[PDB]
Design a protein around this ligand. Structure first.
Ligand SMILES: C=CCO[C@]1(C(=O)O)C[C@@H](O[C@]2(C(=O)O)C[C@@H](O[C@]3(C(=O)O)C[C@@H](O)[C@@H](O)[C@@H]([C@H](O)CO)O3)[C@@H](O)[C@@H]([C@H](O)CO)O2)[C@@H](O)[C@@H]([C@H](O)CO)O1
Lengths: 220, 219
């Protein structure tokens, strides 16, 4: 099973540096071109560059946007792709993806598999942990619950319910900024013949503030 | 530095109907030797990483439904989705691989579906938030269509609009609906003075507002 996991994202001050890594598995690393691609919030995909495979001597190439500012490299012993970013500006804040590129020209050519991405926020504002508030009702075969995650900076927070096993009926709302502090909420709808007899807990994660929180949704 | 332009910027189509979008290249992506065009199409569903659909302009990637089709040569390209499904909701990017790689700026595919009324839930401040002297009254408007909805917080009968934060989810991949959450934030001492907290949506599916409320003193 092909797997690409991006790590190393976070809040970084303007002018700062940062090294993103991309652990891979499920395929023969050295055989592939690996590409870095980014996406600023609500913006298009931008290829930043690639590093070629063994047959090509792992030569590197870049987009003009980041050339001479960003550095790509690969640890073929561990199958890990790297990206060194220097002098980050606001324009660099984005989700960064690593993607498996070309193996054989005769085969193409495109980015076969993408990681989940890791988020970078270039900002002077300070990291702040979230307060997680359980949202219970104050009555009809189907009950809706929620979690209020109040800022908290920077993005993102991860929210799951019962460890991710509650995925259907889950709506999570994009974070809205409020004087350098984000707020988001999540909601789950389960049959009320099922709550509170079975537990509904939300799992909030804010990697930047190193916070992990489990909030059980109790009645009353 | 080949420049890639996509059109339309966005479009809305009902499930079942055919969709076609365009990719134009500032330079030819045709290799005369291989007789192939180095163009790829990608699908990025909401809240997801991109997925490959087509490479070489028209070669369908493994696993990709055959309702997706790529055509074109040189500088003019096209992606066709015969019979659109709700799952097809996404931003579609084209990308040249003729010289390094360069993405277009995407074509957003929205789904035209039937009108649908929101399911409304209201939540008093949690006791643990109240402990902090703050008070957030939260309201969920789930699975409705279209996106344009009017939510007004009536505190003790009177609209508020003070300290309100709203947030919509993208269209759903399954039922093509929207959800939104409205959060009214008060101070605790503010929250005790008033009693009636009403969240109401006036949506194009009714001239009668959909409303949920509690009375603080009944909690
Ligand atoms: C000057 C061209 C020479 O040979 C070609 C041709 O038809 O142009 C291209 C040769 O391409 C490769 C190869 O070993 O197959 C692969 C090329 O890939 C990349 C790159 O690594 O930069 C990436 C690709 O996705 C694509 O963007 C291509 C471009 O289309 C340019 O070719 O570049 C590249 O690595 C070249 C390398 O520069 C050496 O030429 O090698 C190859 O297909 C040969 C064929 O073996 C003989 O004609 O044709």
């Amino acid at each position: 099973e092909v797997m690409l996991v991006e790590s190393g994202g976070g809040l970084v001050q303007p002018g700062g540096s940062l090294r993103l890594s991309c652990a891979t598995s499920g395929f023969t690393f050295t055989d592939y071109y690996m590409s870095w691609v980014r996406q600023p919030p609500g913006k298009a995909l931008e290829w930043l560059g690639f590093i070629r495979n063994k047959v090509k001597g792992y030569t590197i190439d870049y987009s003009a946007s980041v050339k001479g500012r960003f550095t790509i490299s690969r640890d073929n012993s561990q199958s890990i792709l790297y990206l060194q970013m220097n002098t980050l500006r606001a324009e660099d804040s984005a989700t960064y993806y690593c993607a498996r590129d070309m193996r054989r020209f005769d085969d193409g050519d495109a980015m076969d598999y993408w990681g989940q991405g890791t988020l970078v926020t270039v900002s002077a504002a300070k990291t702040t942990p979230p307060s997680v508030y359980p949202l219970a009702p104050g009555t009809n075969s189907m009950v809706t619950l929620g979690c209020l995650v109040k800022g908290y900076f920077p993005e993102p927070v991860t929210v799951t319910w019962n460890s991710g096993s509650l995925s259907s009926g889950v709506h999570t709302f994009p974070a809205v900024l409020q004087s350098d502090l984000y707020t988001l909420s999540s909601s789950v709808t389960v049959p009320s013949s099922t709550w509170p007899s079975e537990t509904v807990t939300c799992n909030v994660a804010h990697p930047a503030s190193s916070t992990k929180v489990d909030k059980k949704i109790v009645p009353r | 530095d080949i420049v890639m332009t996509q059109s339309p910027s966005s479009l809305a189509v009902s499930a079942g109907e055919k969709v076609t979008m365009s990719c134009k290249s500032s330079q030819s992506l045709l290799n005369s030797r291989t007789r192939k065009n180095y163009l790829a199409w990608y699908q990025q569903k909401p809240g997801q990483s991109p997925k490959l659909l087509i490479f070489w302009a028209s070669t369908r990637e493994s696993g990709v439904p055959d309702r997706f089709t790529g055509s074109g040569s040189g500088t003019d390209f096209t992606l066709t989705i015969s019979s659109v499904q709700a799952e097809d909701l996404a931003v579609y990017y084209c990308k040249q691989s003729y010289n390094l790689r360069t993405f277009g700026r995407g074509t957003k595919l929205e789904i035209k579906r039937a009108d649908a009324a929101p399911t409304v839930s209201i939540f008093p401040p949690s006791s643990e938030q109240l402990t902090s002297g703050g008070a957030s009254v939260v309201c969920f408007l789930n699975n409705f269509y279209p996106k344009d909805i009017n939510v007004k917080w009536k505190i003790d009968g009177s609209e508020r609009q003070n300290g309100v934060l709203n947030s919509w989810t993208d269209q759903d991949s399954k039922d093509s609906t929207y959800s939104m959450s409205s959060t009214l934030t008060l101070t605790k001492d503010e929250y005790e003075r008033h009693n009636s907290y009403t969240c109401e949506a006036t949506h194009k599916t009714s001239t009668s507002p959909i409303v949920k409320s509690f009375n603080r003193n009944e909690c």
